[PDB]
Enzyme design. Structure first.
Site, PDB file in Angstrom:
ATOM      1  CD  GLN A  94      -2.843  -0.867   1.934  1.00 61.32           C
ATOM      2  OE1 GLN A  94      -2.409  -1.187   3.633  1.00 61.32           O
ATOM      3  NE2 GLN A  94      -3.970  -0.685   2.006  1.00 61.32           N
ATOM      4  CG  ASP A 151       3.416  16.615 -19.329  1.00 62.22           C
ATOM      5  OD1 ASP A 151       4.002  16.714 -18.765  1.00 62.22           O
ATOM      6  OD2 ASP A 151       3.295  17.723 -20.515  1.00 62.22           O
ATOM      7  CG  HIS A 183      10.735  14.797 -22.419  1.00 67.51           C
ATOM      8  ND1 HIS A 183      10.407  16.508 -23.486  1.00 67.51           N
ATOM      9  CD2 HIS A 183      12.082  15.263 -22.094  1.00 67.51           C
ATOM     10  CE1 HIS A 183      11.862  16.971 -23.427  1.00 67.51           C
ATOM     11  NE2 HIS A 183      12.520  16.161 -22.881  1.00 67.51           N
ATOM     12  CD  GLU A 184      13.850  13.276 -18.883  1.00 62.31           C
ATOM     13  OE1 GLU A 184      14.410  13.000 -19.087  1.00 62.31           O
ATOM     14  OE2 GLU A 184      13.452  14.454 -19.109  1.00 62.31           O
ATOM     15  CG  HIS A 205      15.691  12.555 -24.134  1.00 65.36           C
ATOM     16  ND1 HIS A 205      15.884  13.009 -25.033  1.00 65.36           N
ATOM     17  CD2 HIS A 205      15.698  13.481 -22.606  1.00 65.36           C
ATOM     18  CE1 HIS A 205      15.716  14.743 -24.599  1.00 65.36           C
ATOM     19  NE2 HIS A 205      15.303  15.301 -23.414  1.00 65.36           N
ATOM     20  CE1 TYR A 234      18.872  17.276 -24.663  1.00 65.42           C
ATOM     21  CE2 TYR A 234      20.197  18.559 -23.407  1.00 65.42           C
ATOM     22  CZ  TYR A 234      19.817  17.560 -24.269  1.00 65.42           C
ATOM     23  OH  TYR A 234      17.853  18.458 -23.383  1.00 65.42           O
ATOM     24  CD  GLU A 276      14.980  18.268 -24.367  1.00 68.12           C
ATOM     25  OE1 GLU A 276      13.824  18.644 -23.944  1.00 68.12           O
ATOM     26  OE2 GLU A 276      15.826  17.549 -23.773  1.00 68.12           O
ATOM     27  CD  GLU A 334      -0.108  24.820 -23.605  1.00 67.03           C
ATOM     28  OE1 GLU A 334       1.152  25.262 -22.590  1.00 67.03           O
ATOM     29  OE2 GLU A 334       0.632  25.071 -24.792  1.00 67.03           O
ATOM     30  CD  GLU A 371       0.329  19.716 -18.879  1.00 67.09           C
ATOM     31  OE1 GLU A 371       1.334  20.307 -19.331  1.00 67.09           O
ATOM     32  OE2 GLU A 371      -0.531  18.111 -19.568  1.00 67.09           O
ATOM     33  CB  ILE A 391       0.575  30.001 -11.360  1.00 70.44           C
ATOM     34  CG1 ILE A 391       2.162  30.716 -10.355  1.00 70.44           C
ATOM     35  CG2 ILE A 391       0.308  31.129 -12.272  1.00 70.44           C
ATOM     36  CD1 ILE A 391       2.729  31.671 -11.099  1.00 70.44           C
ATOM     37  CG  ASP A 393       1.894  28.581 -14.969  1.00 67.96           C
ATOM     38  OD1 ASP A 393       1.619  27.567 -14.501  1.00 67.96           O
ATOM     39  OD2 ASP A 393       2.800  28.838 -14.624  1.00 67.96           O
ATOM     40  CG  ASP A 407      19.290  25.225 -22.957  1.00 67.01           C
ATOM     41  OD1 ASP A 407      19.608  24.039 -22.159  1.00 67.01           O
ATOM     42  OD2 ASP A 407      18.373  24.692 -24.118  1.00 67.01           O
ATOM     43  CG  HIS A 436      15.730  22.272 -22.961  1.00 68.12           C
ATOM     44  ND1 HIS A 436      17.472  22.587 -22.259  1.00 68.12           N
ATOM     45  CD2 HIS A 436      15.464  21.134 -22.274  1.00 68.12           C
ATOM     46  CE1 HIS A 436      17.757  21.166 -21.913  1.00 68.12           C
ATOM     47  NE2 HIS A 436      16.489  20.734 -22.029  1.00 68.12           N
TER      48      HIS A 436
HETATM   49 CA   LIG Z   1       1.525  26.222 -13.102  1.00 64.21          CA
HETATM   50 CA   LIG Z   2       0.913  18.477 -21.301  1.00 62.29          CA
HETATM   51 CA   LIG Z   3       3.146   0.853   2.333  1.00 64.62          CA
HETATM   52 CA   LIG Z   4      -2.630  17.841 -19.579  1.00 62.36          CA
HETATM   53 ZN   LIG Z   5      14.697  16.948 -22.578  1.00 61.14          ZN
END
Ligand SMILES: [Ca+2]
Ligand SMILES: [Ca+2]
Ligand SMILES: [Ca+2]
Ligand SMILES: [Ca+2]
Ligand SMILES: [Zn+2]
Length: 316
Positions: free
Chosen positions: A61, A138, A142-143, A146, A157, A166, A187, A190, A197, A200, A226, A231
């Site tokens: 658990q 995402d 994304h990772e 790669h 890279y 990227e 996006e 997010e 916020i 965004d 970078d 990126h």
């Molecule tokens: Ca946010």
């Molecule tokens: Ca997303």
């Molecule tokens: Ca546990």
């Molecule tokens: Ca989403």
């Molecule tokens: Zn990346």
């Protein structure tokens, strides 16, 4: 470890409950034996030594706050594996069911996630800019992407090849988000970015400029920061991918969208059959056009849309 395959339950970073595949041997481990050679999740215990210790739990658990990042890293790695297998017929990142390993609770207040050439690593965030990074599907996809790129095209890279590297990760990270149907959007990050916020994200594929990233080749970053803007300039490719799928008029150029499924097929083929370690944007355009041609014909709407999309972002 060797044991009995079972199923546990827990709560992820966003407080959602989900079932996860575990292995029982005295303790219950975050080891999923149902996918390829397995998915393993480790506890880095706020240190930087990797991978750390295979996650062990006494009762199967996982509702403790400390468990959350592990639950999501484990679960989303599984979803991503399923996407690549079911949609692209690819077994794990190397195409031969390589074991997938992830470590969570890396360092202290670490705001990044990365693939170190052998495994995925997730920080917990500082609580202001980011919350545990594995909470974003995402981000996880994304990772892992790669890793796929490393075993296929091998895009270096740096500079344009790095920006493509990227973008490919953002593109497939998004396609996996749509695959899982988890409040999908165009996006990036997010779900784990700025908890204080709403609305965004870190990057936007639909409108890269929203966060200051270029959406046209004429606005590309040519500096050294970078790694040559990997990126930053990825926004140019992300915008092109968004246009191919959704369509629209950008800088006066109109593109007829062909959908996400075809976008995925075209880019996966480009990645696995035509791209090389030093491919630049112009070569990516050629690879995408050739891929669409292979799949739909030289006089297809698909090929036309790929050409229009790259024209829209100024990539010749
Ligand atoms: Ca946010
Ligand atoms: Ca997303
Ligand atoms: Ca546990
Ligand atoms: Ca989403
Ligand atoms: Zn990346």
């Amino acid at each position: 470890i060797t044991g009995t395959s079972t199923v546990g339950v827990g709560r992820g970073v966003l407080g959602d409950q989900k079932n996860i595949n575990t292995t029982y041997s005295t303790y219950y481990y975050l080891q999923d034996n149902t996918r390829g050679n397995g998915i393993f999740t480790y506890d880095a215990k706020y240190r930087t030594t990797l991978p750390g210790s295979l996650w062990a739990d006494a009762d199967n658990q996982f509702f403790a706050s400390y468990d959350a990042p592990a639950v999501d890293a484990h679960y989303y790695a599984g979803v991503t594996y399923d996407y690549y297998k079911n949609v692209h017929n690819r077994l794990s990142y190397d195409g031969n069911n390589a074991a997938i390993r992830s470590s969570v609770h890396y360092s202290q207040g670490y705001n990044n996630a990365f693939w170190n050439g052998s495994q995925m690593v997730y920080g917990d965030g500082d609580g202001q800019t980011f919350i545990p990074l594995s909470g974003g599907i995402d981000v996880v996809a994304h990772e892992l992407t790669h890793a796929v790129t490393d075993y296929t095209a091998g895009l270096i890279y740096q500079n344009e090849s790095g920006a493509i590297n990227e973008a490919i990760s953002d593109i497939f990270g998004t396609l996996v988000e749509f695959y899982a149907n988890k409040n999908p959007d165009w996006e990036i990050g997010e779900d784990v970015y700025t908890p204080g916020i709403s609305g965004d994200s870190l990057r936007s594929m639909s409108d890269p400029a929203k966060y200051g990233d270029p959406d046209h080749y004429s606005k590309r970053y040519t500096g050294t920061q970078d790694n040559g803007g990997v990126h930053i300039n990825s926004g140019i490719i992300n915008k092109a991918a968004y246009l191919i799928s959704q369509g629209g008029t950008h800088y006066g150029v109109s593109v007829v969208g062909i959908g996400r499924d075809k976008l995925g097929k075209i880019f996966y083929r480009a990645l696995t059959q035509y791209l090389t370690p030093t491919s630049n944007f112009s070569q990516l355009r050629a690879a995408a056009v050739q891929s669409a041609t292979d799949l739909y014909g030289s006089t297809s709407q698909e090929v036309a849309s790929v050409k229009q999309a790259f024209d829209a972002v100024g990539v010749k």
